Amino acid sequence: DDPPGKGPILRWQSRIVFAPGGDAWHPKNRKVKLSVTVKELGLSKHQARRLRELVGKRYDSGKDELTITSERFEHREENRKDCLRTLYGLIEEAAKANKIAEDIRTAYVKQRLQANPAFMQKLQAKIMRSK
């Protein structure tokens, strides 16, 4: 059964090694993984394509699973926070694709409207009236 409240659901993985002898530090301690479903974020298709390009192989298509793993920090909570910051940065950068889509669509539309004898006379008359 899923968590409380509402929103997209994350999945965490974390390790604790219980070594004997009174020395506690083990290299497997500091690795944290987080998994998310891409389609639950509700991004647009172009935003999803930019996300996939920005991600590479951390995205698995059969499950729609985006998994981020952090080992670069010395403590488990630090790697967890790094994973969440990376997820927020990925969503923020992936959302930008709509503006580029709108800009190049308007560029194509305006290229189509420049080469038209019907529209150019009306545009020139309207800019001649106001000079």
Binding site: R49, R50, L54, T86, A101, I104
Partner: protein
């Protein structure tokens, strides 16, 4: 067509943004760099 332009211009600018998000080191010209020898542990104490 419009389809190839819309499918190709949305994936641009990712090269520096990915390095900024993930903290990677970017070397576009492939010179010899000390990053590969500073990314390894300090095995002095162990010894």
């Amino acid at each position: 067509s419009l389809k190839n332009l819309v499918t190709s211009a949305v994936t641009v600018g990712v090269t520096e943004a990915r390095a900024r998000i993930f903290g990677h080191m970017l070397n576009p010209t492939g010179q010899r760099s000390p990053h590969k020898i500073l990314r390894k542990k300090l095995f002095g104490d162990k010894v």
